[PDB]
Amino acid sequence: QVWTPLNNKFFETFSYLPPMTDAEISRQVDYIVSNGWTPCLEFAGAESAYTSNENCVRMQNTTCLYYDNRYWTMWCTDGGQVLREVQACRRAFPDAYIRVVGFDPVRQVQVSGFLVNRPASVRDYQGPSTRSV
Amino acid sequence: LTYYTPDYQPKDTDILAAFRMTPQPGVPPEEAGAAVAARYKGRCYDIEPVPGEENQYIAYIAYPLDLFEEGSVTNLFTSIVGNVFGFKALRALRLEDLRIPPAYVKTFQGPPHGIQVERDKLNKYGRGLLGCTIKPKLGLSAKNYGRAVYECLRGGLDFTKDDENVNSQPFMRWRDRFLFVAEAIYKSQAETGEIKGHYLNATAATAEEMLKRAECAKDLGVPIIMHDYLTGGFTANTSLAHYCRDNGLLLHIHRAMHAVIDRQRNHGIHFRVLAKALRLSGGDHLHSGTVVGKLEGEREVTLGFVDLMRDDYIEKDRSRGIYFTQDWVSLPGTMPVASGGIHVWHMPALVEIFGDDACLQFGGGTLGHPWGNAPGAAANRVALEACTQARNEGRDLAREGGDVIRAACKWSPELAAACE
Amino acid sequence: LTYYTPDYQPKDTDILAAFRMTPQPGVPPEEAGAAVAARYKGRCYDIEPVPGEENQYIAYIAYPLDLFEEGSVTNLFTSIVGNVFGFKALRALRLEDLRIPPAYVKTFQGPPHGIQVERDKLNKYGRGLLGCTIKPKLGLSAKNYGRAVYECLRGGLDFTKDDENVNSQPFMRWRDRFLFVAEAIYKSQAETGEIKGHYLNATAATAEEMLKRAECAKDLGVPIIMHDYLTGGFTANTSLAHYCRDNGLLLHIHRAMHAVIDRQRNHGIHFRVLAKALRLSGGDHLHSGTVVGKLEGEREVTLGFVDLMRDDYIEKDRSRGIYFTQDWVSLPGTMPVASGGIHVWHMPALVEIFGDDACLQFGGGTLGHPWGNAPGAAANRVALEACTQARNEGRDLAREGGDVIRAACKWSPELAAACE
Amino acid sequence: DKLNKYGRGLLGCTIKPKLGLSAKNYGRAVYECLRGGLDFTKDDENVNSQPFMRWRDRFLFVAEAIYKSQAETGEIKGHYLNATAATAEEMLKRAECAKDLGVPIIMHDYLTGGFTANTSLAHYCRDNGLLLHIHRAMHAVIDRQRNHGIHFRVLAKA
Amino acid sequence: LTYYTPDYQPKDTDILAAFRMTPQPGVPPEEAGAAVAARYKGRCYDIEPVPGEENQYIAYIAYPLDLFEEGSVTNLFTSIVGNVFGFKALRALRLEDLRIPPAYVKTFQGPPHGIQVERDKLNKYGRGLLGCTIKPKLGLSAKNYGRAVYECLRGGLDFTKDDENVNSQPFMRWRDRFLFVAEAIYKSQAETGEIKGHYLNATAATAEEMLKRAECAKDLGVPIIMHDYLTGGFTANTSLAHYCRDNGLLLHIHRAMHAVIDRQRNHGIHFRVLAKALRLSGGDHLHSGTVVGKLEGEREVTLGFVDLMRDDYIEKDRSRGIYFTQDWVSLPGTMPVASGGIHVWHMPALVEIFGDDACLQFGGGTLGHPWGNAPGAAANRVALEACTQARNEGRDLAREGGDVIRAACKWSPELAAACE
Amino acid sequence: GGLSAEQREFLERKAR
């Protein structure tokens, strides 16, 4: 079989697994909470979801390690609350990818980041069986 | 003995070494420790015999901080192990550990970015990184090398790397390879939407040539380069690490020629000291182990030097080979890179042993997947993500790795052709 | 075995290695040689057993010339001994010799000046050179270091040198030492009328700092600098050697950390390979032996690597450890430097063993002469000149060294206080 | 004229927490505050270059945040990047990085860095078209007591 | 004769020359060879008479490798043919061939990219390249020159080139031409989707000006430049080739003033020696022949120097003028460029003679197509592709070239107006 | 672990 290079976009962690269900998202959020970390939600439409070099035109010397759309837009006690917020974000922005992020409150660093929602309207991604043709 | 002072209390600024030495018969251990030790004099303050070994002792030496040049791994190695392995009074001598006082650590820049800055720059969290060594090792043209890089990266791999002996040869000059690899990296980035990279080998004959190759990598905008620090030298490595910090480049470190110094148990320098010297000199990644069949070497020793090269504060643990408490005073950590034959069903073991802050390298070049390079990379990525997800759910990977692999294979056609 | 080809005839451009390997029991020697060997493939073409050793064999490997980067000792060592000492199938492995084909040799600059250009620049002919290591090793201020240098040089010594661990410390910064040593060198030159020099240590943390120290030495007009190539690295050494050729500076090379790689007979890289790598990378002098009591190590082995690092054409001689004929195609030779406890009555032996093309180093700092540093230097110079004159007359030094020393002492008051 | 903002005061925020935040999280906070409608954000006065957040990582992440907020809102945005450093060479290098990123404005502590360093930075900013925000750290040590010291108005004129 | 040694066996590192000499009557051939030959002495080791010529002999001279400066074609030509064509004892003298030992070859960088790297960079495989010389030769403004370049490239030509005498004149300054040609190249690339190029003439009065023109070409991002090596000089050429390797630029070489040295059979230097000197100095393309009517010159001689400038290993073949076996030890090959009146029906002959690794140049400026420059370029491209396809099918081009051309013309309206 | 007489003898000296 051949890995398809057409409409096969991916979003880093857990993006190569089948779309996670509510129970799986809940278990991941519980894992984040268990470690002592804070979960939050990021979202972006299809125009600002993938990495790009749009602003590299303004730079000189080098553009090493600079990529656009690394930041998404921010949307935290347990899995159920984060799931409710996931549904709320889905209703508010149906054409936007949702990403669950984790933040270590002591080190003040991001420790987690996995996609939990892919807009049905957008078709820039494949499915577990359509990834190979 | 003016140089054996068992009542001496080491200062907070002393550099401490733990030597495993086997003196010649008739030489008392106190005399041998005094010799190794011999205001600016090194002194043996502690000698312990090794229970279960033949005439083997651990000698603890304290060196004053004024003895060394600030921020110079070269000087540190010249002072500590310059001419001490040639003493006739010692049948065998092995440096086991070093204690770098914070006062000395603060004089070093350290790794250019570290693990957390690397994760933030690459926007990858919660999982180990994946890499492949482009194979065949040599003979491939820059165009074909770039084609292989693009094929492996588009599958889902986060990194690819040049072979350790690929610097600049008649078959493939370095600038052609850099250009074709840059095109491949950018194509794979556009196709998958994830940030990709390739460990471009900057190891060269002269520091000027090495800096020129780093400069070309910086001008292409590519993320990361590679260096052979034990063959290029600490002086060349430190220059490259300073350059990478200045210009925002990641630095992968390969430990070529390491077994010539850290293989024999009785003679040489233990890899943990070389790992601490690398972290001081600078490196974002450091090839730290081989997985032939399984992770080779005592697990505790591996865990010890992985913690020594990763954490900020490592307490003394003789079980794992930590002879001294090591405070890193906020020096950036180095990401360990486990390479070799990482088979798909062996991923759960390595994910359990290393965790998320490591790079698993398929130095075998994969190619074992009947479909191609890209599906093989996808299978590996699927397996790693499935193992990580299972571990996050509370599963015991060492007991359910096969079950997790099978369950992932049930829905992954690419992994199905890999699991067979 | 695709990699064991006993009928293969090595090409005139192949790089040849002679490995002394002890395979694990049950592993045939042909299989182990095939593994070490494994168009661009290294191949084992010859295996000979070591008569008088336990399961020890010499494996001859042929590498194609296209495998290596032109003028890069770093790449050569990465390719040959990068990851081969870590093979589990080998109980022990030792690289004994290398054959550098002329085609490869011509891609290297080599030593900046060589022996003959050194003699012409220093205007010293027909005798060995003399040097001292300023002692105490550390703690001395730049002013006092310069005073010691001037006192030792005015006596008749041709060179002095910084201690191997003296680079730049709180007690003595490097630029102060360079300035005071320059004043001392010029004072001793004016006083004696002979050209003097001091091995200024340029070994530093970064290549930039090392080049800055070399630049300061060039701006002072002093003749020679020093480098630690096994700790600084081949990349740093090659940069320094290119700089020294460009700016007309001599380069003394110290082999710090050598015993960590060339001491054990079963594992490591023999010093002769490190000496050939140094000659390729560049160095006018290379500390080549210690004289504790007497010249240590098998004489034939020492003579072998001295000839390998000095002569232009060395024929294969297994008695002296030459496993391959080495053609240097007019590459400048490196002057061997024998250091350690060179006592006055031991000068005839070393003059006989080394001849005129060597530097005898009093690394003990002398100080054994009751009168002072300067008369001790004079005594040494008188002894060396008397031994050379006796050898030129047809005397057998190994049999009449004591007679020659006594006869010189009969007229030398300085040597009289030294001979006691 | 450069910022195309007329008829109103400008608005700025100091990214908080003061210290401990990673360059990524600092950039995230900058982007979140700027996208709301703020014209400027600024580094904390004591944020120059620390083990927790090196200066070049912060400059890069802040540049990405500034450009994202500009694209989202359509208004020109900026962040007072702290160029205050130990040596004039390091300070000019940080200003040079800001110039190479195309970001609008940098910051300096003139009473702690010194007038000599400030004048060099101001000449550089005029030469390269960069705005310069000045923070008066250590001012109360000289302009607080009514009987002794130098009144702030003299420091403002200087 | 101390310089005629018929029993001498040339070394593997000797530089060998084969001189065709006609001595004055009364001078024996052995004496004349001894004179040309006259540890560092050149020696005549072999003399053979030319069967079928009047008093003509081939003298073989062996020069030691130490005689020449590493990587210097200038020195090689100064040593070999500096002052030997002015000997009164020789009626005529002609250097026929040179043997460059691998040891010497390794000291040269060679062509910046070579044939295979060129093909990979341009992404063109399996066919010869096509070029045109913009005509009229002179008088055209930079704007009109660019217009002609764009019109010829959009038709399907891979390259265009400046006239040999077009460097920088009042009618067309060089920077205006570079800018307009860059615009034309980019327009043609966007229109056709194939990578295009134009041989920009960097030949200038001073090396500084030549490097400035190369720098402008590099700043425009254009692929290739041109140089006149026999008029600019080997020193200027070697500088340009090093620059092109450093900055990733292709280098086309034009052999202006060649007939002044390689035309007469009795006196001068044969073009094959100039081609080997160019390959050593550096050049990706080398104008190698003219096709006035048909490929001019003995086919075997042309094939010989084409193989000498293309292949890695050329065995001695006196039938094709190869007097010595030439090992290139992986030096990049040079692409031969056949220029002149390449008419459409003459394409099969040149495709058969040269193969795919050559550039056919329409130095006549085409313009013979009644429709325009672009359709004429298309006709040429169609003819070349049809001939290549026929050759790949097993057709005999020398016998079916007309049939293939007619068959291609049956479906190509552009070729129909060209075939008439 | 087992310490040889020498190692044990050294221990006694270190104790003294």
Residue numbers in the entry:
A (entry chain P): 2 to 76, 83 to 140
B (entry chain A), C (entry chain L), E (entry chain C): 22 to 59, 79 to 460
D (entry chain I): 160 to 317
F (entry chain Z): 164 to 179
Recite the paper's sentences.
As the primary gateway between atmospheric carbon dioxide (CO2) and organic carbon, ribulose-1,5-bisphosphate carboxylase/oxygenase (Rubisco) fixes ~400 gigatons of CO2 annually. Eukaryotic algae concentrate and fix CO2 in phase-separated condensates called pyrenoids, which complete up to one-third of global CO2 fixation. Condensation of Rubisco in pyrenoids is dependent on interaction with disordered linker proteins that show little conservation between species. We report the linker from Chlorella and demonstrate that it binds a conserved site on the Rubisco large subunit.
To determine where CsLinker binds CsRubisco, we elucidated the 3D structure of the α3–α4–CsRubisco complex using cryogenic electron microscopy (cryo-EM). During processing, we observed a low-resolution density in addition to the core subunits at the equatorial region of CsRubisco in the RbcL. We hypothesized that this additional density corresponded to the helical regions of α3–α4 and that substoichiometric binding meant many binding sites were unoccupied, giving rise to poorly resolved density where the linker binds. Using a symmetry expansion approach, with a soft featureless mask around the additional density, we found ~23% of the 8 CsRbcL sites to be occupied by additional density in the symmetry expanded subparticles. We built the helical region of α3 into the density and numbered residues according to their position in the full-length protein. Each CsLinker binding site is contained within the N-terminal region of a single CsRbcL subunit, utilizing two salt bridges on a hydrophobic interface. The two salt bridges are between Arg176 of α3–α4 and Glu51 of the CsRbcL, and between Lys177 of α3–α4 and Asp86 of the third beta-sheet (βC) in CsRbcL. Phe173 of α3–α4 dominates the hydrophobic interaction in a pocket formed by Ile87 and Tyr97 of the CsRbcL. We validated the binding interface by site-directed mutagenesis (SDM) of the α3–α4 fragment, selecting substitutions that disrupted the hydrophobic and salt-bridge interfaces. In both cases, disruption of α3–α4–CsRubisco complex formation by native PAGE was observed.
